[PDB]
Amino acid sequence: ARTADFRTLERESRFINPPKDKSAFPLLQEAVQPHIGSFNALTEGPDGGLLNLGVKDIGEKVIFDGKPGYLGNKLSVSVEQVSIAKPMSVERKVYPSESRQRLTSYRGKLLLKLKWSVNNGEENLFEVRDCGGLPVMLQSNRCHLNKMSPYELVQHKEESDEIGGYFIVNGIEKLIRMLIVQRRNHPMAIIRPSFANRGASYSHYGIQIRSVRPDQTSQTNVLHYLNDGQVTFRFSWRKNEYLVPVVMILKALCHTSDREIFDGIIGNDVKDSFLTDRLELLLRGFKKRYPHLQNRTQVLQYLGDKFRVVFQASPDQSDLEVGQEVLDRIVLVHLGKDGSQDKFRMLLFMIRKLYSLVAGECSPDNPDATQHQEVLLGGFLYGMILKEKIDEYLQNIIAQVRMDINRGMAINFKDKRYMSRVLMRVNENIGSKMQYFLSTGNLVSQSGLDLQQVSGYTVVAEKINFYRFISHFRMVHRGSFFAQLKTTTVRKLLPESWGFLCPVHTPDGSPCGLLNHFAHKCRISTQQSDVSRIPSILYSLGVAPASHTFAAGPSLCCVQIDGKIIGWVSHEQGKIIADTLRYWKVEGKTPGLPIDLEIGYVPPSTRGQYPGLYLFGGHSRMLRPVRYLPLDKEDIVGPFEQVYMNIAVTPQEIQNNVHTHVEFTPTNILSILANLTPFSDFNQSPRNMYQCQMGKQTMGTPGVALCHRSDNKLYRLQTGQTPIVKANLYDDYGMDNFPNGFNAVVAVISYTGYDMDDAMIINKSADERGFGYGTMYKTEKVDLALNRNRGDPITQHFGFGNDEWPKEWLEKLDEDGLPYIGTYVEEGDPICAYFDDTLNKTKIKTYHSSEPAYIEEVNLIGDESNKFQELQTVSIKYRIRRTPQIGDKFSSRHGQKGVCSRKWPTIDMPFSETGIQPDIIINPHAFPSRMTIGMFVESLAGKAGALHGIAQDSTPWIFNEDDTPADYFGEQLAKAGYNYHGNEPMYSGATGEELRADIYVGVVYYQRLRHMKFQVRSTGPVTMQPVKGRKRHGGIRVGEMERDALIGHGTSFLLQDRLLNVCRECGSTQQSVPRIGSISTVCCRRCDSQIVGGNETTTVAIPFVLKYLDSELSAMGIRLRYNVEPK
């Protein structure tokens, strides 16, 4: 029957009785899923999540005792496990909204256990050494609201359906912004000129792979190519870089000979000349450069000695041991330990691609293309920085032991009291520094995480509107370094981003083209898939093992799983294998092959991308559902996989043999807010972007828990209605629980003449009925301990008495402790009174604001510690009523923003046959330039829905040209008995006569924005120039261009009044010191009667910046013959 529905009964039932089972609209849960999944996989993994793995692989920091080849005893400090602690104390749980009302942080507690092995397995001293309080994530594993019913959430002072990856620190609710980086285990080719500019003989070419350890730790490994003919491996450790020849590492990885390297780089391509000559040049160069380095152990020792302070190696460490450690830790880290046999096999593949890049047989790969892009989640960065801080903490205890050895000379290395002395002298504020990182966004580390930004990783994550709040969790940022970059091509909307990033949702302005948003129904796999058995089934098909036979080059389809070369096969067989693997992945009924397996087969290409089949179990890769034609079952596809897949956007357009997938619901390639726009297929793309940017600026419905949500600003809209033309999935996302805007009876008519460009007019009566009554909630913190220190209680405390404090303060500052809740605070009103003993009298706090407000909620905050004292900490909330005056920006859902031109009186407003007087008037001239047919269609469908009672759905790509929405809604209007085109006849409100033509009138959804400014001064605050600031009663600066405009008109006196309104002898002051009863005279030292000074100085008219300039030059030691004019 009906295409959509309001579901009023369901909405009211849900409002009255929150569900006690699985929450409704699950899509929101699997829309905030990536953050929750990341934070859970940080601890909820196969073996201690990722934190235990990371701390296990942190290292074995060792220092040696000075006990007289031996030196003393070791320390072998390690870390065993990291635990969870959500509540806070006699132990009690602490739910969120705490430290929200307190305006503090919602932190957990970090349990840390370490080792004190004095030597190899002799005396191990385990100890739990908890380090501060970790700021945990809401709705995550480490939160009391982990798996709660919506009813339980309602019970625990929480939003009826609350979800969020934001961290509550200082009561600010910040969030880790997502970042997008290179892939994990894929070596790509780069032709950036910076490689050539690195130094002499450097080329533009070079392979790059951003490998990641099983704890998701990045490590770059670049292969620059030199013009002479040698290839130089490059990496980075600490904050610096260290470069080494490639063949050095090739020979160090395994006990393998040069002819084997020849076969590895060139397989059956002996008749090639370019490759063979380049390889022979490389081998001869290595042989002549390092003749002594023959033995594999010898080259290992060479590496160890070349890198001894580079890796902070312990003095008791053999050179072979150090070399093995460095080539196990810093190169091809994603292959892990004991995989050196494959690490040697990977470089032979990486080199051959580089020579293919040199010869041009392979095309480069765009770093900013989504094929090779990849997003790391908030949780992963949290774990990475935590591991870095733990490693730094171990380094710090090592340094403290070193200092004690240097000076203290009181060492035991086997005494618990000694351990206590050591630990008591180091910092255990790991949680505190994590809180600082969340609060500021300033990343500080030694390794640098192979990132590129420094400052800015946490966004405030405001909740102006529910739309903006939910959008905070879907934005992916390219990088602040890219933001500083001025190249346009990075900001292009690449086709490869089809189905992953929203083509529409993008802020307009400076960050345009950068803050992309993921499409809805796009998931990030925050979990390593079961990739163990994949090689086994892969060997089942027709392949060859990576070790039995040697064959390289693009002529053979390389096969690798997450960076492990495992097989080589022809390209035809590679395509067959890719298709069969697709069959078995979507078909199920296979112990391995998870459905979310990103598999990419690049066919052989003429001068194209480098061939070879690829598989990616992945740990942060992007995923996207899509139907699979041969089985009509859901299939998952990634970006790298998509480029060579023949998707069809509709089942209608599925051709023969040119399609295998069809993304059902083509609306899925879009942001949530973009899908919320009605009839996005009838507007102009800039207008769609304007709408997306405007919706996040709305006077929204922040939530329902606003009773206790003390924050800086809320912008709560008092009323609100569902859209009569609501898009489908508006209800499916539970957006109805956060309605904003109102249905307005709009009239596309040029009547008043007070609206030509973008202005609009509201009906004065409709405003008086309360058309839109958004209100502002503002809280600020008031306390007296900001200057108080720990051991010094303040002489001043709340209240007031036993003084001669001014009367009339009991107007609103009337109680023993605080003002009344219900009061109308004017400017300068007594906000709160504190009795002070320092002055032995009470003092009060002024309002210090602009608009008079009403107190909404005053709450008492207690110290987290047992600091009973006198509770010198109070938080109060201001309620501000924002009735829509003129100039307040309203807008529709199509970017047709405008300001309230004038509250047109109802009688003068034009009316219709039915007697309805439209409330919102817009000028028809906007549309021909704006080109938003969506506004017209929304008006038409809104009238039809308001008449028939039904709800109209506005989903893009549901009206074919043969099913025109104009005709579809005209049929409904005709059957309802109204004008087919919506043109309702109307009569003027002043003359009372009928208008020339029937007016286009309908109902549309209208949103109020928060951009509500005027400043004026005559005298007051003041180089003697007026101060800067609207709120400081300042002035306005007359800029240089304003001065030029003053000159251009030739208005000399005008310029003088806008920029305004001496020692006679020296001409470059000093005067006015009367002695007894004489008038003021001059005694300029630079120059009784003239004592010796001078008596030549008279008043002149000059700016008072001149005296400051004179004094500055006097300090500068520079003086000029300032020719003082005569009388």
């Binding site: 009023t8 009964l9 929150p18 009773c707 009569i724 007087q917």
Partner: protein, 68 residues
């Protein structure tokens, strides 16, 4: 938070919210017939009863003066 007075026209509709709910739930109807029997003819009136999110039920159970 039912709009007491019609924004555009001015017909009182605050009283009619409960009646609309009863007519929708107790007796099986549709919204159009429910509004018709309720006595609303112009869509300027029909808005504030066809579309009104009752954000007092969800917004109200967070009472501070009663034990949870």
């Amino acid at each position: 938070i039912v709009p007491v007075r019609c924004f555009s026209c001015g017909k009182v509709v605050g009283d009619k919210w409960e009646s609309y709910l009863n007519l929708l739930q107790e007796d099986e109807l549709d919204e159009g017939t429910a509004l018709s029997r309720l006595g609303l003819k112009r869509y300027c009136c029909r808005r504030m009863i066809l579309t009104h999110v009752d954000l007092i039920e969800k917004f109200l159970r967070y009472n501070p003066l009663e034990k949870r």
